[PDB]
CSV table of C-alpha atoms and ligand atoms in Angstrom, one decimal:
chain,number,residue,atom,x,y,z
G,1452,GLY,CA,24.7,-0.3,31.7
G,1453,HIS,CA,22.2,2.5,30.7
G,1454,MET,CA,21.7,4.0,27.2
G,1455,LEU,CA,21.1,7.6,28.0
G,1456,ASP,CA,20.7,8.7,24.3
G,1457,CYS,CA,17.0,8.1,23.6
G,1458,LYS,CA,14.3,10.7,22.8
G,1459,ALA,CA,10.6,11.2,23.5
G,1460,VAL,CA,8.6,11.9,20.3
G,1461,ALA,CA,5.3,13.7,20.1
G,1462,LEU,CA,3.3,12.0,17.3
G,1463,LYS,CA,0.1,13.1,15.6
G,1464,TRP,CA,-2.1,11.3,13.0
G,1465,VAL,CA,-4.2,13.7,10.9
G,1466,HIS,CA,-7.1,13.4,8.5
G,1467,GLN,CA,-7.9,16.8,6.9
G,1468,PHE,CA,-11.0,16.8,4.6
G,1469,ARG,CA,-13.9,19.0,3.2
G,1470,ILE,CA,-17.6,18.6,4.1
G,1471,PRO,CA,-20.8,20.3,3.0
G,1472,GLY,CA,-21.2,23.7,4.9
G,1473,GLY,CA,-24.5,22.7,6.5
G,1474,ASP,CA,-22.9,19.6,8.1
G,1475,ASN,CA,-20.7,19.3,11.3
G,1476,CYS,CA,-17.3,17.6,11.5
G,1477,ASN,CA,-18.6,15.5,14.5
G,1478,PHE,CA,-21.0,13.7,11.9
G,1479,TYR,CA,-17.8,12.3,10.3
G,1480,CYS,CA,-15.2,11.7,13.1
G,1481,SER,CA,-15.7,10.3,16.6
G,1482,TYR,CA,-13.3,10.0,19.6
G,1483,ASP,CA,-13.9,6.2,19.1
G,1484,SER,CA,-12.8,6.1,15.5
G,1485,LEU,CA,-9.7,8.2,16.2
G,1486,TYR,CA,-8.7,6.0,19.2
G,1487,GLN,CA,-8.9,3.0,16.7
G,1488,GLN,CA,-6.6,4.8,14.3
G,1489,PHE,CA,-4.1,5.1,17.3
G,1490,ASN,CA,-4.5,1.4,18.0
G,1491,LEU,CA,-3.2,0.7,14.4
G,1492,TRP,CA,0.1,2.6,15.0
G,1493,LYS,CA,3.1,0.1,14.9
G,1494,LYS,CA,4.2,-0.2,18.6
G,1495,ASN,CA,7.2,-2.6,17.8
G,1496,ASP,CA,9.4,-0.5,15.5
G,1497,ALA,CA,13.1,-1.4,15.6
G,1498,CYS,CA,13.8,2.2,16.9
G,1499,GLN,CA,11.3,1.8,19.8
G,1500,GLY,CA,12.7,1.7,23.4
G,1501,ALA,CA,10.7,0.8,26.5
G,1502,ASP,CA,7.4,2.1,28.0
G,1503,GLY,CA,5.4,2.3,24.8
G,1504,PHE,CA,3.1,5.3,24.2
G,1505,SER,CA,1.2,7.7,26.3
G,1506,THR,CA,-2.7,7.9,26.4
G,1507,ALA,CA,-3.9,9.0,22.9
G,1508,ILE,CA,-5.8,12.4,22.7
G,1509,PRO,CA,-8.4,12.6,19.9
G,1510,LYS,CA,-9.2,16.1,18.5
G,1511,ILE,CA,-11.8,17.5,16.1
G,1512,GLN,CA,-11.4,20.9,14.5
G,1513,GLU,CA,-13.9,22.7,12.1
G,1514,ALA,CA,-13.7,26.0,10.1
G,1515,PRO,CA,-15.6,27.4,7.1
G,1516,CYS,CA,-13.4,27.2,4.0
G,1517,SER,CA,-13.2,30.7,2.2
G,1518,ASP,CA,-11.8,29.1,-1.1
G,1519,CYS,CA,-14.3,26.2,-1.2
G,1520,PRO,CA,-17.8,26.2,-2.7
G,1521,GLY,CA,-19.7,26.5,0.7
G,1522,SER,CA,-17.6,23.7,2.3
G,1523,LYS,CA,-16.1,23.4,5.8
G,1524,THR,CA,-12.6,22.1,6.5
G,1525,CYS,CA,-12.5,19.2,9.1
G,1526,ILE,CA,-9.2,18.3,10.8
G,1527,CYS,CA,-9.5,15.0,12.7
G,1528,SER,CA,-6.5,14.0,14.7
G,1529,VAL,CA,-5.1,11.7,17.3
G,1530,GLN,CA,-1.9,12.5,19.3
G,1531,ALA,CA,0.3,10.6,21.6
G,1532,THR,CA,3.9,10.6,22.9
G,1533,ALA,CA,6.4,7.7,22.1
G,1534,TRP,CA,8.2,7.8,25.5
G,1535,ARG,CA,11.5,6.3,24.4
G,1536,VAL,CA,12.9,6.2,20.8
G,1537,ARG,CA,16.5,5.6,19.7
G,1538,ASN,CA,18.7,8.3,18.2
G,1539,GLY,CA,20.8,8.1,15.1
G,1540,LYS,CA,20.9,5.0,13.0
G,1541,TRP,CA,20.1,1.6,14.5
G,1542,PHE,CA,21.2,-1.9,13.3
G,1543,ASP,CA,18.6,-4.6,14.4
G,1544,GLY,CA,20.9,-7.6,13.6
G,1545,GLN,CA,19.9,-7.8,9.9
G,1546,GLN,CA,19.6,-4.2,8.6
G,1547,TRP,CA,19.8,-0.4,9.4
G,1548,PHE,CA,16.9,1.8,10.5
G,1549,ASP,CA,16.9,5.6,10.4
G,1550,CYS,CA,15.6,6.7,13.8
G,1551,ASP,CA,15.2,10.4,12.8
G,1552,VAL,CA,11.6,11.8,13.5
G,1553,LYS,CA,10.5,11.9,9.8
G,1554,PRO,CA,11.4,8.2,8.9
G,1555,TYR,CA,10.4,7.0,12.3
G,1556,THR,CA,6.9,8.8,12.2
G,1557,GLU,CA,6.3,7.5,8.7
G,1558,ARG,CA,7.0,3.9,9.7
G,1559,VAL,CA,4.9,4.1,13.0
G,1560,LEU,CA,1.9,6.1,11.7
G,1561,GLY,CA,2.1,4.9,8.0
G,1562,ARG,CA,1.4,8.4,6.6
G,1563,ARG,CA,3.6,11.1,5.0
G,1564,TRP,CA,5.3,13.4,7.7
G,1565,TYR,CA,5.2,17.2,7.6
G,1566,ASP,CA,7.4,19.5,9.7
G,1567,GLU,CA,5.4,21.6,12.2
G,1568,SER,CA,6.7,24.7,10.2
G,1569,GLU,CA,4.1,23.7,7.5
G,1570,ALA,CA,0.6,24.7,8.7
G,1571,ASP,CA,-2.5,22.4,8.2
G,1572,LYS,CA,-3.9,25.1,5.7
G,1573,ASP,CA,-0.8,24.6,3.5
G,1574,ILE,CA,-1.1,20.8,3.4
G,1575,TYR,CA,-3.2,19.3,0.5
G,1576,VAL,CA,-2.9,15.5,1.1
G,1577,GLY,CA,-5.8,14.2,3.1
G,1578,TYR,CA,-3.9,11.9,5.5
G,1579,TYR,CA,-0.6,12.9,7.1
G,1580,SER,CA,1.5,12.7,10.2
G,1581,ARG,CA,3.4,15.0,12.6
G,1582,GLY,CA,6.4,14.1,14.7
G,1583,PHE,CA,8.8,16.1,16.7
G,1584,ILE,CA,11.2,15.6,19.7
G,1585,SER,CA,9.5,16.5,23.0
G,1586,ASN,CA,12.4,15.4,25.3
G,1587,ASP,CA,16.0,14.4,24.5
G,1588,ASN,CA,18.6,12.3,26.5
G,1589,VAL,CA,16.1,9.9,28.1
G,1590,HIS,CA,17.0,6.3,29.1
G,1591,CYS,CA,16.1,3.7,26.3
G,1592,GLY,CA,15.1,1.2,29.0
G,1593,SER,CA,12.3,1.6,31.6
G,1594,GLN,CA,15.0,1.7,34.4
S,384,ZN,ZN1,18.3,3.2,32.1
S,385,ZN,ZN1,18.7,2.5,29.9
S,386,ZN,ZN1,-11.1,10.4,8.4
S,387,ZN,ZN1,-10.9,10.9,10.6
């Protein structure tokens, strides 16, 4: 057979922090360190289908913070797509797993998930995750 009820999930690991206004965000974050955060994502979750994850894309963002005492806001992130993820609830033989994007993202990235409707400027925890459906109704297997 074929299981045609899997989804592709766009995932993003975020570190948002403040730095002194005379510094640059690239003194704190590197493409190398963000790639190593990606390597720490769980790649064998019970909800994971075949074909693993896309190439990770590191990103560094900087802006002066109006509300801070002379500080800049740094947003260091690494994004990738989980090509094939199960839909619904999944029984692995011993227990149930919720394969919804929020609980799936939190298990795989290990940080609290926030809906894309909540902007980075309205999130006050330092480490968090993003996850949303980028493709629905894909095969769960690689064929
Ligand atoms: Zn198939
Ligand atoms: Zn299949
Ligand atoms: Zn960091
Ligand atoms: Zn970082």
